[PDB]
Amino acid sequence: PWRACTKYLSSAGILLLSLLVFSQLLKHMVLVAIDYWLAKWTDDQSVYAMVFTLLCSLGIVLCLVTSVTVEWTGLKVAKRLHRSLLNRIILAPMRFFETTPLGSILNRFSSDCNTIDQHIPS
Amino acid sequence: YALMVSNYLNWMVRNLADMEIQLGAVKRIHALLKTEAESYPSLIPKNWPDQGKIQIQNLSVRYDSSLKPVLKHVNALISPGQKIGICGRTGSGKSSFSLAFFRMVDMFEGRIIIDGIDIAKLPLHTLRSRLSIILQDPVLFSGTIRFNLDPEKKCSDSTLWEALEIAQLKLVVKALPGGLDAIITEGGENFSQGQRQLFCLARAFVRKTSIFIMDEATASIDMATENILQKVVMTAFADRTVVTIAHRVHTILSADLVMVLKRGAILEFDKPETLLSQKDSVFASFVR
Protein backbone atom coordinates (compact mmCIF):
# COMPACT_ATOMS: atom_id res chain seq x y z
CA PRO A 1 0.00 0.00 0.00
CA TRP A 2 2.89 2.39 -0.70
CA ARG A 3 0.81 4.42 -3.15
CA ALA A 4 -1.66 5.18 -0.36
CA CYS A 5 1.20 6.49 1.79
CA THR A 6 2.45 8.57 -1.15
CA LYS A 7 -1.00 10.09 -1.70
CA TYR A 8 -1.45 10.76 2.02
CA LEU A 9 1.91 12.49 2.44
CA SER A 10 1.49 14.47 -0.78
CA SER A 11 -1.82 15.82 0.53
CA ALA A 12 0.16 17.31 3.45
CA GLY A 13 2.55 19.44 1.40
CA ILE A 14 6.33 19.60 1.39
CA LEU A 15 6.40 22.15 4.24
CA LEU A 16 4.60 20.05 6.87
CA LEU A 17 6.15 16.77 5.69
CA SER A 18 9.68 18.18 5.84
CA LEU A 19 9.02 19.76 9.24
CA LEU A 20 7.68 16.44 10.55
CA VAL A 21 10.58 14.34 9.24
CA PHE A 22 13.16 16.85 10.46
CA SER A 23 11.54 17.07 13.91
CA GLN A 24 11.40 13.27 14.31
CA LEU A 25 15.00 12.72 13.20
CA LEU A 26 16.38 15.55 15.32
CA LYS A 27 14.34 14.49 18.37
CA HIS A 28 15.74 10.97 18.24
CA MET A 29 19.22 12.42 17.68
CA VAL A 30 18.85 14.58 20.80
CA LEU A 31 17.63 11.50 22.68
CA VAL A 32 20.71 9.44 21.80
CA ALA A 33 22.81 12.56 22.45
CA ILE A 34 21.61 12.93 26.04
CA ASP A 35 21.96 9.18 26.63
CA TYR A 36 25.57 9.39 25.41
CA TRP A 37 26.29 12.56 27.38
CA LEU A 38 25.23 10.51 30.40
CA ALA A 39 28.10 8.08 29.77
CA LYS A 40 30.53 10.94 29.20
CA TRP A 41 29.13 12.55 32.37
CA THR A 42 29.76 9.62 34.72
CA ASP A 43 33.57 9.86 34.99
CA ASP A 44 34.27 20.21 36.15
CA GLN A 45 31.10 18.39 37.22
CA SER A 46 29.13 21.66 37.09
CA VAL A 47 29.85 21.94 33.35
CA TYR A 48 28.66 18.37 32.75
CA ALA A 49 25.48 18.95 34.76
CA MET A 50 24.75 22.22 32.95
CA VAL A 51 25.23 20.67 29.50
CA PHE A 52 23.04 17.73 30.52
CA THR A 53 20.27 20.09 31.65
CA LEU A 54 20.57 22.10 28.42
CA LEU A 55 20.31 18.95 26.30
CA CYS A 56 17.31 17.64 28.27
CA SER A 57 15.51 20.96 27.77
CA LEU A 58 16.37 20.79 24.06
CA GLY A 59 14.95 17.26 24.00
CA ILE A 60 11.62 18.11 25.61
CA VAL A 61 11.23 21.12 23.30
CA LEU A 62 12.00 19.01 20.23
CA CYS A 63 9.55 16.31 21.33
CA LEU A 64 6.75 18.83 21.91
CA VAL A 65 7.54 20.18 18.42
CA THR A 66 7.31 16.76 16.78
CA SER A 67 4.04 15.90 18.55
CA VAL A 68 2.27 19.16 17.68
CA THR A 69 3.58 18.78 14.13
CA VAL A 70 2.26 15.25 13.57
CA GLU A 71 -1.15 16.27 14.91
CA TRP A 72 -1.35 19.42 12.78
CA THR A 73 -0.37 17.38 9.71
CA GLY A 74 -3.09 14.85 10.50
CA LEU A 75 -5.74 17.56 10.75
CA LYS A 76 -4.63 19.28 7.53
CA VAL A 77 -4.55 16.07 5.49
CA ALA A 78 -7.98 15.09 6.83
CA LYS A 79 -9.42 18.46 5.78
CA ARG A 80 -7.85 18.41 2.30
CA LEU A 81 -8.81 14.80 1.54
CA HIS A 82 -12.41 15.18 2.73
CA ARG A 83 -12.92 18.37 0.71
CA SER A 84 -11.40 16.84 -2.43
CA LEU A 85 -13.53 13.69 -2.10
CA LEU A 86 -16.78 15.62 -1.60
CA ASN A 87 -16.04 17.88 -4.58
CA ARG A 88 -15.02 14.98 -6.84
CA ILE A 89 -18.22 13.06 -6.07
CA ILE A 90 -20.36 16.17 -6.59
CA LEU A 91 -19.06 16.33 -10.19
CA ALA A 92 -19.82 12.63 -10.80
CA PRO A 93 -22.25 11.63 -13.58
CA MET A 94 -25.56 9.91 -12.97
CA ARG A 95 -24.58 6.58 -14.56
CA PHE A 96 -21.89 6.34 -11.87
CA PHE A 97 -24.49 6.77 -9.10
CA GLU A 98 -26.80 4.24 -10.76
CA THR A 99 -24.06 1.61 -11.13
CA THR A 100 -22.25 2.21 -7.83
CA PRO A 101 -24.05 0.98 -4.68
CA LEU A 102 -25.18 3.75 -2.36
CA GLY A 103 -23.71 1.80 0.56
CA SER A 104 -20.13 2.12 -0.70
CA ILE A 105 -20.34 5.86 -1.42
CA LEU A 106 -21.84 6.43 2.02
CA ASN A 107 -19.28 4.13 3.68
CA ARG A 108 -16.32 6.05 2.27
CA PHE A 109 -17.58 9.12 4.15
CA SER A 110 -18.86 7.15 7.16
CA SER A 111 -15.96 4.90 8.20
CA ASP A 112 -12.81 5.70 6.21
CA CYS A 113 -12.98 9.47 6.76
CA ASN A 114 -13.43 8.67 10.46
CA THR A 115 -10.32 6.49 10.16
CA ILE A 116 -8.24 9.26 8.58
CA ASP A 117 -9.56 11.68 11.21
CA GLN A 118 -8.85 9.59 14.32
CA HIS A 119 -6.54 6.61 13.81
CA ILE A 120 -4.08 7.51 11.03
CA PRO A 121 -2.43 10.43 12.93
CA SER A 122 -1.72 8.52 16.15
CA TYR B 1 19.86 -0.05 24.52
CA ALA B 2 20.36 -3.69 23.51
CA LEU B 3 18.34 -4.63 26.60
CA MET B 4 15.25 -2.80 25.41
CA VAL B 5 15.67 -3.25 21.63
CA SER B 6 13.04 -6.01 21.81
CA ASN B 7 10.17 -3.77 22.92
CA TYR B 8 10.99 -1.45 20.03
CA LEU B 9 11.07 -4.37 17.58
CA ASN B 10 7.73 -5.94 18.48
CA TRP B 11 6.00 -2.58 19.00
CA MET B 12 7.25 -1.56 15.55
CA VAL B 13 6.02 -4.69 13.77
CA ARG B 14 2.66 -4.39 15.56
CA ASN B 15 2.43 -0.76 14.44
CA LEU B 16 3.32 -1.73 10.86
CA ALA B 17 0.53 -4.31 10.76
CA ASP B 18 -1.78 -1.71 12.32
CA MET B 19 -0.61 0.87 9.77
CA GLU B 20 -1.16 -1.05 6.52
CA ILE B 21 -4.78 -1.88 7.41
CA GLN B 22 -5.60 1.72 8.32
CA LEU B 23 -3.77 3.04 5.23
CA GLY B 24 -5.97 0.84 3.05
CA ALA B 25 -8.75 3.28 3.96
CA VAL B 26 -6.82 6.21 2.48
CA LYS B 27 -6.01 3.99 -0.51
CA ARG B 28 -9.66 3.29 -1.31
CA ILE B 29 -10.61 6.93 -0.60
CA HIS B 30 -8.08 7.96 -3.26
CA ALA B 31 -9.39 5.19 -5.53
CA LEU B 32 -12.92 6.61 -5.32
CA LEU B 33 -11.45 10.13 -5.72
CA LYS B 34 -10.58 9.32 -9.36
CA THR B 35 -14.12 8.84 -10.67
CA GLU B 36 -15.10 10.53 -13.93
CA ALA B 37 -16.54 14.04 -13.86
CA GLU B 38 -19.05 15.73 -16.15
CA SER B 39 -17.66 18.67 -18.14
CA TYR B 40 -19.91 21.21 -16.46
CA PRO B 41 -21.88 32.40 -23.19
CA SER B 42 -23.94 33.73 -26.12
CA LEU B 43 -27.38 32.32 -25.25
CA ILE B 44 -26.83 32.81 -21.49
CA PRO B 45 -27.28 36.63 -21.24
CA LYS B 46 -30.56 36.24 -23.14
CA ASN B 47 -33.19 35.19 -20.60
CA TRP B 48 -34.68 31.78 -21.29
CA PRO B 49 -37.78 32.16 -23.50
CA ASP B 50 -41.21 31.08 -22.31
CA GLN B 51 -41.87 29.71 -25.82
CA GLY B 52 -41.95 25.95 -25.28
CA LYS B 53 -41.34 25.22 -28.97
CA ILE B 54 -38.68 22.49 -29.04
CA GLN B 55 -37.36 20.08 -31.66
CA ILE B 56 -35.47 16.78 -31.41
CA GLN B 57 -33.92 15.69 -34.72
CA ASN B 58 -32.56 12.15 -35.20
CA LEU B 59 -32.22 11.40 -31.49
CA SER B 60 -30.63 8.20 -30.18
CA VAL B 61 -29.43 7.30 -26.70
CA ARG B 62 -27.36 4.55 -25.07
CA TYR B 63 -26.78 4.06 -21.35
CA ASP B 64 -23.20 2.74 -21.41
CA SER B 65 -20.41 3.49 -23.86
CA SER B 66 -20.74 1.20 -26.91
CA LEU B 67 -23.81 -0.72 -25.74
CA LYS B 68 -27.28 -1.48 -27.07
CA PRO B 69 -29.10 1.76 -27.98
CA VAL B 70 -32.21 2.86 -26.10
CA LEU B 71 -33.76 5.05 -28.81
CA LYS B 72 -33.53 4.82 -32.60
CA HIS B 73 -34.26 7.71 -35.00
CA VAL B 74 -36.33 9.87 -32.65
CA ASN B 75 -37.67 13.05 -34.29
CA ALA B 76 -40.34 15.26 -32.75
CA LEU B 77 -41.47 18.87 -32.43
CA ILE B 78 -43.45 20.62 -29.69
CA SER B 79 -45.39 23.85 -30.24
CA PRO B 80 -45.32 26.73 -27.72
CA GLY B 81 -47.73 26.52 -24.81
CA GLN B 82 -49.11 23.12 -25.84
CA LYS B 83 -49.53 20.29 -23.35
CA ILE B 84 -47.68 17.17 -24.52
CA GLY B 85 -47.76 13.59 -23.29
CA ILE B 86 -45.73 10.45 -23.90
CA CYS B 87 -47.10 6.92 -23.48
CA GLY B 88 -45.51 3.48 -23.69
CA ARG B 89 -45.06 0.31 -21.67
CA THR B 90 -42.28 -0.43 -19.19
CA GLY B 91 -38.76 -0.01 -20.52
CA SER B 92 -40.06 1.71 -23.65
CA GLY B 93 -37.82 4.77 -23.37
CA LYS B 94 -39.83 7.56 -21.74
CA SER B 95 -37.62 7.86 -18.65
CA SER B 96 -34.56 7.70 -20.91
CA PHE B 97 -36.22 10.41 -23.01
CA SER B 98 -36.59 12.67 -19.96
CA LEU B 99 -33.00 11.92 -18.93
CA ALA B 100 -31.71 12.82 -22.40
CA PHE B 101 -33.81 15.99 -22.16
CA PHE B 102 -31.79 16.94 -19.05
CA ARG B 103 -28.38 15.83 -20.45
CA MET B 104 -28.25 12.95 -17.95
CA VAL B 105 -27.32 10.13 -20.35
CA ASP B 106 -23.76 10.62 -21.61
CA MET B 107 -24.02 8.58 -24.84
CA PHE B 108 -26.72 10.46 -26.77
CA GLU B 109 -26.50 11.13 -30.50
CA GLY B 110 -28.60 13.53 -32.56
CA ARG B 111 -29.68 17.13 -32.10
CA ILE B 112 -31.97 18.17 -29.24
CA ILE B 113 -32.95 21.84 -29.39
CA ILE B 114 -34.95 23.98 -26.95
CA ASP B 115 -35.70 27.26 -28.76
CA GLY B 116 -32.54 27.22 -30.85
CA ILE B 117 -30.32 26.23 -27.91
CA ASP B 118 -28.51 22.95 -27.21
CA ILE B 119 -26.04 21.46 -24.72
CA ALA B 120 -22.91 22.20 -26.80
CA LYS B 121 -21.88 25.45 -25.08
CA LEU B 122 -23.82 25.63 -21.79
CA PRO B 123 -22.57 24.40 -18.39
CA LEU B 124 -24.73 22.32 -16.08
CA HIS B 125 -25.55 25.24 -13.76
CA THR B 126 -27.15 26.99 -16.74
CA LEU B 127 -28.59 23.81 -18.29
CA ARG B 128 -30.57 23.02 -15.12
CA SER B 129 -31.81 26.49 -14.11
CA ARG B 130 -33.96 26.49 -17.28
CA LEU B 131 -36.30 23.50 -16.86
CA SER B 132 -38.16 21.93 -13.95
CA ILE B 133 -38.89 18.28 -13.16
CA ILE B 134 -41.06 16.34 -10.70
CA LEU B 135 -39.74 12.78 -10.46
CA GLN B 136 -41.83 9.73 -9.58
CA ASP B 137 -40.07 9.42 -6.19
CA PRO B 138 -40.88 12.42 -3.96
CA VAL B 139 -38.52 13.24 -1.11
CA LEU B 140 -38.57 15.86 1.68
CA PHE B 141 -35.08 16.32 3.10
CA SER B 142 -34.71 17.52 6.68
CA GLY B 143 -34.94 21.18 7.60
CA THR B 144 -37.70 23.79 7.55
CA ILE B 145 -40.47 24.45 5.04
CA ARG B 146 -38.42 27.39 3.76
CA PHE B 147 -35.62 24.85 3.19
CA ASN B 148 -37.88 22.34 1.41
CA LEU B 149 -39.62 24.83 -0.89
CA ASP B 150 -36.55 26.95 -1.75
CA PRO B 151 -33.18 25.66 -0.49
CA GLU B 152 -31.58 28.64 -2.23
CA LYS B 153 -33.61 30.91 0.10
CA LYS B 154 -33.95 33.50 -2.67
CA CYS B 155 -37.74 33.86 -2.86
CA SER B 156 -39.71 35.95 -0.38
CA ASP B 157 -42.16 34.75 2.26
CA SER B 158 -45.04 36.06 0.14
CA THR B 159 -43.82 33.96 -2.79
CA LEU B 160 -43.68 30.82 -0.64
CA TRP B 161 -47.13 31.48 0.84
CA GLU B 162 -48.50 31.98 -2.68
CA ALA B 163 -46.87 28.77 -3.92
CA LEU B 164 -48.36 26.90 -0.96
CA GLU B 165 -51.78 28.43 -1.65
CA ILE B 166 -51.64 27.47 -5.33
CA ALA B 167 -50.48 23.92 -4.50
CA GLN B 168 -53.40 23.44 -2.04
CA LEU B 169 -51.07 23.23 0.95
CA LYS B 170 -51.37 26.58 2.76
CA LEU B 171 -53.97 25.42 5.29
CA VAL B 172 -51.92 22.46 6.52
CA VAL B 173 -48.78 24.62 6.66
CA LYS B 174 -50.49 27.31 8.76
CA ALA B 175 -51.36 24.55 11.27
CA LEU B 176 -47.67 23.89 12.06
CA PRO B 177 -45.64 25.44 14.91
CA GLY B 178 -43.97 28.67 13.82
CA GLY B 179 -45.11 28.72 10.21
CA LEU B 180 -42.82 27.82 7.29
CA ASP B 181 -40.37 26.65 9.98
CA ALA B 182 -41.57 23.19 11.06
CA ILE B 183 -38.76 20.71 11.76
CA ILE B 184 -39.23 18.01 9.11
CA THR B 185 -37.35 14.72 9.01
CA GLU B 186 -36.16 12.66 6.05
CA GLY B 187 -39.39 11.16 4.72
CA GLY B 188 -41.01 9.76 7.84
CA GLU B 189 -44.66 10.33 8.73
CA ASN B 190 -44.73 14.13 8.86
CA PHE B 191 -46.65 14.59 5.58
CA SER B 192 -48.82 12.30 3.48
CA GLN B 193 -47.93 11.11 -0.01
CA GLY B 194 -50.33 13.65 -1.49
CA GLN B 195 -48.70 16.33 0.64
CA ARG B 196 -45.28 15.21 -0.63
CA GLN B 197 -46.42 15.48 -4.25
CA LEU B 198 -47.86 18.90 -3.38
CA PHE B 199 -44.47 19.96 -2.00
CA CYS B 200 -42.90 18.77 -5.26
CA LEU B 201 -45.43 20.83 -7.23
CA ALA B 202 -44.68 23.85 -5.03
CA ARG B 203 -40.98 23.41 -5.79
CA ALA B 204 -41.84 23.31 -9.50
CA PHE B 205 -43.90 26.49 -9.05
CA VAL B 206 -41.16 28.39 -7.21
CA ARG B 207 -38.69 27.23 -9.88
CA LYS B 208 -40.37 29.45 -12.50
CA THR B 209 -38.41 27.70 -15.26
CA SER B 210 -41.33 28.01 -17.77
CA ILE B 211 -40.72 24.40 -18.94
CA PHE B 212 -42.16 21.59 -16.81
CA ILE B 213 -41.51 17.84 -17.10
CA MET B 214 -43.97 15.65 -15.17
CA ASP B 215 -42.42 12.19 -14.73
CA GLU B 216 -45.16 9.89 -13.38
CA ALA B 217 -46.83 12.11 -10.79
CA THR B 218 -49.63 9.51 -10.55
CA ALA B 219 -48.00 6.34 -9.19
CA SER B 220 -48.33 5.57 -5.47
CA ILE B 221 -51.26 8.00 -5.25
CA ASP B 222 -54.93 7.25 -4.64
CA MET B 223 -57.26 7.91 -7.56
CA ALA B 224 -59.53 10.13 -5.45
CA THR B 225 -56.51 12.33 -4.74
CA GLU B 226 -54.66 11.85 -8.05
CA ASN B 227 -57.66 13.12 -10.04
CA ILE B 228 -57.81 16.34 -8.01
CA LEU B 229 -54.02 16.66 -8.22
CA GLN B 230 -54.10 16.39 -12.02
CA LYS B 231 -56.99 18.88 -12.15
CA VAL B 232 -55.05 21.38 -10.03
CA VAL B 233 -51.88 20.88 -12.07
CA MET B 234 -53.84 21.47 -15.28
CA THR B 235 -55.66 24.55 -13.96
CA ALA B 236 -52.40 26.07 -12.69
CA PHE B 237 -50.45 25.21 -15.87
CA ALA B 238 -52.22 26.97 -18.73
CA ASP B 239 -48.88 28.07 -20.22
CA ARG B 240 -45.26 26.89 -19.79
CA THR B 241 -45.70 23.74 -21.88
CA VAL B 242 -45.61 20.52 -19.85
CA VAL B 243 -44.39 17.12 -21.07
CA THR B 244 -46.04 14.33 -19.07
CA ILE B 245 -45.36 10.59 -18.95
CA ALA B 246 -47.61 8.05 -17.21
CA HIS B 247 -49.58 4.83 -17.70
CA ARG B 248 -53.00 6.27 -16.78
CA VAL B 249 -55.71 6.36 -19.43
CA HIS B 250 -57.07 9.82 -18.58
CA THR B 251 -53.62 11.40 -18.23
CA ILE B 252 -52.60 10.30 -21.73
CA LEU B 253 -56.07 11.18 -23.06
CA SER B 254 -55.84 14.76 -21.76
CA ALA B 255 -52.56 15.43 -23.60
CA ASP B 256 -52.59 16.85 -27.12
CA LEU B 257 -49.39 15.58 -28.77
CA VAL B 258 -48.65 11.96 -27.84
CA MET B 259 -45.80 9.74 -29.05
CA VAL B 260 -46.43 6.00 -28.82
CA LEU B 261 -43.16 4.33 -27.80
CA LYS B 262 -42.48 1.25 -29.94
CA ARG B 263 -39.95 -1.49 -29.18
CA GLY B 264 -36.97 0.57 -30.34
CA ALA B 265 -38.40 3.76 -31.82
CA ILE B 266 -41.29 6.21 -31.35
CA LEU B 267 -44.28 7.23 -33.46
CA GLU B 268 -45.66 10.70 -32.75
CA PHE B 269 -49.20 11.99 -33.26
CA ASP B 270 -50.26 15.63 -33.03
CA LYS B 271 -54.03 15.44 -32.51
CA PRO B 272 -55.10 13.15 -29.63
CA GLU B 273 -58.66 12.44 -30.79
CA THR B 274 -57.31 11.69 -34.28
CA LEU B 275 -54.85 8.95 -33.28
CA LEU B 276 -57.16 7.63 -30.55
CA SER B 277 -59.61 6.53 -33.28
CA GLN B 278 -57.52 6.27 -36.47
CA LYS B 279 -55.90 2.98 -35.40
CA ASP B 280 -59.41 1.55 -34.78
CA SER B 281 -58.71 1.62 -31.02
CA VAL B 282 -55.97 -1.02 -31.12
CA PHE B 283 -52.61 0.60 -30.32
CA ALA B 284 -53.49 3.99 -28.79
CA SER B 285 -56.89 3.68 -27.09
CA PHE B 286 -57.05 0.27 -25.41
CA VAL B 287 -53.33 0.44 -24.63
CA ARG B 288 -53.81 3.77 -22.84
Side-chain angles (χ1 to χ4, degrees), chain A, chain B residues 1-35 37 39 41-42 45 48-49 52 69 76 78 80-81 85 88 91 93 98 100 102 105 110 113 116 120 123 128 132-134 138-140 143-145 151 156 159-161 163 167 169-170 172-173 175 177-179 182 187-188 191-192 194 199 202 204 210-211 213 217 219 224 236 238 242-244 246 254-255 258 264-265 272 274 277 281 284 287:
Chain A
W2 289 260
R3 53 189 55 181
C5 187
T6 298
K7 282 296 185 298
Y8 183 91
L9 294 181
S10 299
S11 188
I14 54 176
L15 170 62
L16 283 187
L17 178 60
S18 291
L19 208 163
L20 185 145
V21 174
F22 160 82
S23 295
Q24 285 286 149
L25 284 181
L26 202 58
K27 184 202 71 176
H28 282 87
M29 281 306 106
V30 171
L31 219 56
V32 50
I34 74 132
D35 274 359
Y36 164 92
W37 192 250
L38 210 175
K40 261 190 167 179
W41 201 112
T42 59
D43 38 2
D44 48 5
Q45 295 284 52
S46 303
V47 175
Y48 277 99
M50 186 198 65
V51 175
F52 193 85
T53 305
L54 181 143
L55 259 72
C56 280
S57 301
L58 207 163
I60 67 173
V61 168
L62 208 37
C63 185
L64 178 57
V65 159
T66 203
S67 170
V68 161
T69 281
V70 304
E71 286 303 323
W72 182 267
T73 280
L75 271 193
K76 243 201 182 182
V77 181
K79 180 182 178 181
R80 296 300 190 272
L81 225 58
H82 176 272
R83 170 176 293 108
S84 67
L85 180 65
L86 193 58
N87 289 5
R88 285 296 292 179
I89 67 109
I90 271 305
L91 306 179
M94 265 310 305
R95 276 298 305 173
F96 161 80
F97 280 97
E98 303 283 7
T99 298
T100 309
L102 179 57
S104 164
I105 303 181
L106 178 57
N107 222 331
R108 291 307 171 271
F109 286 77
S110 176
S111 180
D112 294 328
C113 267
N114 168 51
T115 286
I116 307 175
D117 289 358
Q118 315 289 49
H119 290 250
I120 250 83
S122 175
Chain B
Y1 272 67
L3 175 83
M4 77 177 317
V5 72
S6 165
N7 313 1
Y8 294 155
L9 274 182
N10 73 37
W11 186 33
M12 177 189 75
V13 56
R14 162 172 57 251
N15 275 350
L16 204 79
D18 193 15
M19 172 79 178
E20 58 177 345
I21 173 63
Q22 292 184 4
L23 205 68
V26 181
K27 188 187 59 53
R28 83 195 77 160
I29 285 295
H30 264 274
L32 197 141
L33 251 165
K34 292 196 307 300
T35 53
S39 61
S42 179
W48 201 256
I78 289 182
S98 185
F102 258 110
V105 174
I113 280 180
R128 312 285 162 76
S132 181
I133 174 71
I134 301 180
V139 63
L140 290 178
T144 60
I145 300 184
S156 181
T159 305
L160 265 61
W161 280 115
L169 208 66
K170 192 177 182 180
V172 77
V173 165
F191 291 91
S192 181
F199 273 111
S210 305
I211 297 292
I213 306 294
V242 189
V243 180
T244 62
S254 181
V258 283
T274 298
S277 61
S281 298
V287 183

